[PDB]
Structures are given as structure tokens and as C-alpha cells.
Design a binder for this molecule. Structure first.
Ligand SMILES: *[C@@H]1O[C@H](CO)[C@@H](O[C@@H]2O[C@H](CO)[C@@H](O)[C@H](O)[C@H]2NC(C)=O)[C@H](O)[C@H]1NC(C)=O
Lengths: 35, 258
């Protein structure tokens, strides 16, 4: 491959090897529950 | 600026100031020794130990963040562009105009443009879009020389033209004027206004909330172009953010009552 366009979050391990650009949408981790 | 950085004079308790603070000089040959404390100061102090580097901190003289008057850049950006410093920590919003000359790290907090009102349905609301009705004459914020000022001037000519009669003394005078009634609405950065309503006389609030954020961006650390320090500090700060202490610092320095 040559470029990744996907919902790929940023972490230290991946940041060690590949180079990222500026982010464009913030998010977090959340819990899914059924009503 | 806002509690990211706070300047305090030394106290006669020890002929200075205690630890958890770092001496800071107000440049201008003679100097008086102040010491500065705040959020960015704490993050810099935490960062210093791991990468093991030395530092000296000094204030800006001309002030007023950043601007471009015929290429005469003042403030921190001016200081770092003319090779008078190595980094510029503190409040700074990454945008297109600034990033062309100076390199940046990853963001660490979320921010953007928000609206403050006394206790409208977005920027495209007709009240701010069509200033022609004389019965609800509204008012705005627009602290001059501001990062958001460039955006609002570049994107909406009519709003910039009609925003001339706007209160402009500080992030302090605007709150007083709004509590008085001399104006109708206020626009400025987000991370500072949402805190400013945290601990206030009564409960003055804003519109819907974080759902109304325009040109979402973050604060970042500027650095001189093409230096290994850029990559090193960026990776270190990513590791620190992944650790999770940023939430602890936020709850220590960014909590309110209302
Ligand atoms: C932005 O910062 C500059 C630099 O300190 C300020 O310069 C003033 O500019 C106005 C015209 O825009 C002049 O009338 C003043 O004489 C200048 N000096 C001072 C001390 O005010 C300016 O006030 C700031 N704001 C704007 C909108 O330019």
C-alpha cells in the first residue's frame, strides 16, 4: 500500500513507525447498551 | 492568558515563591523576578524530566498573540519566526495561515469558536447573517487581534463590517458588560469561555453546548522548522496523552461549580 484513508486512531506504538497528519474529527471510547 | 498560564509576584514568605512554580522574567536590561504557574507550565515541567533537556522561560514583550502587518509578525509567532526562541508554549490555534511558516505538534485539548449569551441557532442564524432589522439590535464579542477574528473576517464580510461597535478591553470587561446588558452576544475561543462560566457570580451560560463548535481545532506546541526536537517532543507528548494523566490535570485545573 501507499496511503491509508480509514477511521484509524493514533497511538504511541503506531506513531513509532508511520507518520500521521493532523486530525479531522475527535472521538473517544464509549459503552453500547441495549434499552 | 486564561488559567493555562498565570503570573504571580513572589511572596515575602521565603523571599520568593515556593516550588510547583518556575521563575519567569518579563523581558523588555534590568528585570524583576516573577514566577509563573499554570496548566502549560505544569505540562512543560512534566515533559522536561523524561527527555532530559534544559529550559529558560521568558515572557513576550509586544504581546497580542500573533498577526501579520506587512510581514511584521509580533508576539510569540514573531519571536519564533525570527530565530529568537526555540518553542512557544501556551494558547495557540493551528490554522492555515500560521502553519505555512512554523511547524506544529499534535493537539492536546479541544477548542473552537463558541457563543456566549446572558441567561440563536448557530452561526448561520439570520440574526448574525442579516444585520438589517433595527428592532433586535444585537451585539457581539470579537476581541481584536484574535485568531478567530481572521476567520470571521475572511468568511463573512457583512459580520466583520457590522462588528465595529463591539466591546474590546479583555476577557474580563466583556463578562462585566454582558452582566450589565450593554451587549447581546459574545464570540471567542471555546476552552476559555466554557471554563469562564464554571465559577461565576450566578450562572451565566452559553447555547446548546459542545454541539455548537465551529472550526474545531486544538492547542499545540510551536517549534522551529526542521528540528529533531519537533519529532521528539511530538512522540513524547503522544505517549503522555496515551498514558491518561491529561484528565487528571484537567480535573485539577479545569473544573467549575455551575
Ligand atoms: C493590534 O495590535 C497592534 C499592535 O500593538 C495595535 O496597534 C494599534 O493599531 C491602531 C490601528 O489599528 C492604531 O490606531 C494604534 O495607534 C496602534 N497602537 C496602539 C497602541 O493601539 C492595535 O491596537 C491592535 N488591534 C488592532 C485592531 O489593530
Amino acid at each position: 500500500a501507499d496511503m491509508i484513508v480509514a477511521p484509524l486512531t493514533i497511538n504511541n506504538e503506531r506513531a513509532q513507525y508511520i507518520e500521521f497528519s493532523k486530525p479531522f474529527k475527535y472521538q473517544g471510547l464509549t459503552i453500547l447498551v441495549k434499552k | 492568558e486564561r488559567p493555562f498560564v498565570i503570573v504571580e509576584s513572589p511572596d515575602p514568605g521565603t523571599g520568593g515563591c515556593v516550588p510547583n512554580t518556575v521563575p519567569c522574567r518579563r523581558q523588555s536590561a534590568p528585570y524583576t523576578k516573577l514566577c509563573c504557574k499554570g496548566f502549560c507550565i505544569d505540562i512543560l515541567k512534566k515533559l522536561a524530566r523524561v527527555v532530559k533537556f534544559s529550559y529558560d522561560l521568558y515572557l513576550v514583550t509586544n504581546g497580542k498573540h500573533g498577526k501579520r502587518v506587512r510581514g511584521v509578525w509580533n508576539g510569540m509567532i514573531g519571536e519564533v519566526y525570527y530565530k529568537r526562541a526555540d518553542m512557544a508554549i501556551g494558547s495557540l490555534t493551528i490554522n492555515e495561515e500560521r502553519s505555512e511558516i512554523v511547524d506544529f505538534s499534535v493537539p492536546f485539548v479541544e477548542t473552537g469558536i463558541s457563543v456566549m449569551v446572558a441567561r440563536v441557532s448557530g452561526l448561520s442564524d439570520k440574526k448574525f447573517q442579516r444585520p438589517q432589522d433595527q428592532y433586535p439590535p444585537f451585539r457581539f464579542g470579537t476581541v481584536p487581534n484574535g485568531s478567530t477574528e481572521r476567520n470571521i473576517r475572511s468568511n463573512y464580510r457583512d459580520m466583520h463590517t457590522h462588528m465595529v461597535k463591539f466591546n474590546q478591553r479583555s476577557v474580563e470587561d466583556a463578562l462585566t458588560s454582558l452582566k450589565m446588558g450593554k451587549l447581546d452576544a459574545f464570540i471567542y475561543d471555546a476552552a476559555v469561555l466554557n471554563y469562564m462560566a464554571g465559577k461565576d457570580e450566578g450562572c451565566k451560560l452559553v447555547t446548546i453546548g459542545s454541539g455548537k463548535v465551529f472550526a474545531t481545532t486544538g492547542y499545540g506546541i510551536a517549534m522551529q522548522k526542521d528540528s529533531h526536537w519537533k519529532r521528539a517532543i511530538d512522540l513524547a507528548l503522544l505517549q503522555f496523552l496515551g498514558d491518561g494523566e491529561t484528565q487528571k490535570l484537567e480535573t485539577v485545573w479545569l473544573s467549575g461549580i455551575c
